[PDB]
Amino acid sequence: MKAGVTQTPRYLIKTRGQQVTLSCSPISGHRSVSWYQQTPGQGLQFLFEYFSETQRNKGNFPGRFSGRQFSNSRSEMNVSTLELGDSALYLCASSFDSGNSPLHFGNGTRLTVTEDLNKVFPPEVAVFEPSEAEISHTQKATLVCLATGFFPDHVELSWWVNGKEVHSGVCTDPQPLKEQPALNDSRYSLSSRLRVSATFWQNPRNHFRCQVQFYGLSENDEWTQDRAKPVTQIVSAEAWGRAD
Amino acid sequence: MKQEVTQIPAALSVPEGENLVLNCSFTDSAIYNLQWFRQDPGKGLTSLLLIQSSQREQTSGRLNASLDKSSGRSTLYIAASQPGDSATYLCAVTNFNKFYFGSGTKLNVKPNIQNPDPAVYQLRDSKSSDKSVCLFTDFDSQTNVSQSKDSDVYITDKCVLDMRSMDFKSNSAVAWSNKSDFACANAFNNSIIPEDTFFPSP
């Protein structure tokens, strides 16, 4: 399998006034690299496009948003003097030719700008085992995973059954719910379900794990709070099947 | 002149199997291409169609899009919709020295539940959590799940899971709280739920 567009890093948490530099590598053979900012409020907005090491086109961002392209077509963008409203998904797209050929997007770098690193919390994660009544009525068994109390929304939740990653029988909420909807610093919650047959749940050898990867602070961020530094980490919960 | 890209509807919810129409318009007809994309939650964009300024239409699979450059319009037709079409659909145009995206159509294609069996179950507490958790499941896709009256009762929206090797799909919503005056019997009282919903004894 050949690589698609790659972007590095995937997640960043910064405070106001800091700067970030983001990288993107195009698909092999693509020479046009474009950057876009996606926010909930302004949608996708064009930053700039590079080809053969020079900027070809630019949007309407102020000069604290900058870019560049190296001779192997890799591109960087930089944002200085970060503001809360700079929190966004920073998307790169490569193309053979943006005038007549499709844009191929990366998955983005997620940036959150916060007032204070003391706003950052990892998720608490718990699994809730199936109802007996569900099992008797349907011959199916639904496990629920909750990931709660996290900020920012930099989480990836996945289910593993006997060590293998499952997608059949799963549904994870597309967006989290704000625990306190009116506040800009509100912590988040996310739910997910995994449904199996009653027979599979009833085998005590079957092992179920809900995994949440949280992308948090850097080792270079200072931390002076009593609570554990909210670094990048996995928080997990598990269950085993049960005959009765 | 200033380019403005408009998309309607902003949101579309339809039963699976139905054909869909996604509208895009642009005020400045001097474009080099128009492109349609989908975006899934937590992902970047995938290119679906690119229509050159000299072209009137493009097709791929169940997707067909027209371009009427002088009218400032494109329409995306999605035949025979599937659950896996659910996504945000974005229209973009390339102008001489700028690029512009519409605000999107958020499409939800709902599964047809062949044997609804609406119920509200209580999940077991976790020994490592303080929450009480309730599951409303197995209802028809016409059921709408509302938020709670209460600010410390959390309710998610319906989510469809597919048990592939059983040919079985189901909707569910989760409710939870750590308040003590909270019961699964009451958890979904602010939703209009089916009158035959099964409420097992606790």
Author numbering:
A (entry chain B): 1 to 244
B (entry chain A): 1 to 15, 17 to 203
Quote the study's own text.
We generated 12 structures of the F11 TCR, that recognizes a peptide from the influenza hemagglutinin protein (PKYVKQNTLKLAT) presented by HLA-DR*0101 (DR1-PKY), between 1.58 and 1.89 Å resolutions; 5 structures of the DR1-PKY specific HA1.7 TCR, between 2.31 and 2.98 Å resolution; and five structures of the 003 TCR, that recognizes an HIV-GAG-derived peptide (SLYNTVATL) presented by HLA-A*0201 (A2-SLY), between 1.26 and 1.37 Å resolution. Indeed, the CDR loops of the third TCR included in our study, the 003 TCR, were superimposable in all the structures solved. The 003 TCR structures, which exhibited practically identical CDR coordinates, were solved at an average resolution of 1.31 Å. Finally, none of the 003 TCR CDR loops, which were identical in each structure, made any potentially stabilizing crystal lattice contacts. However, we observed several CDR loop re-organizations between structures for the HA1.7 and F11 TCRs, while all structures of the 003 TCR were identical at the level of the Cα backbone. In order to determine the appropriate Ecut for TCRs, we performed rigidity analysis using the 003 TCR at cutoffs of −2 kcal/mol and −3 kcal/mol (data not shown). Analysis at a cutoff of −3 kcal/mol, but not −2 kcal/mol, demonstrated that the structure was largely flexible, with very few large rigid clusters. Although this analysis is an approximation and should be treated as such, the average maximal loop motion was slightly less (6.4 Å) for the 003 TCR compared to F11 (8.7 Å) and HA1.7 (9.0 Å), consistent with the structural data demonstrating greater rigidity in the 003 TCR. On average, the 003 TCR CDR loops moved slightly less compared to the F11 and HA1.7 TCR CDR loops, in line with the structural analysis.
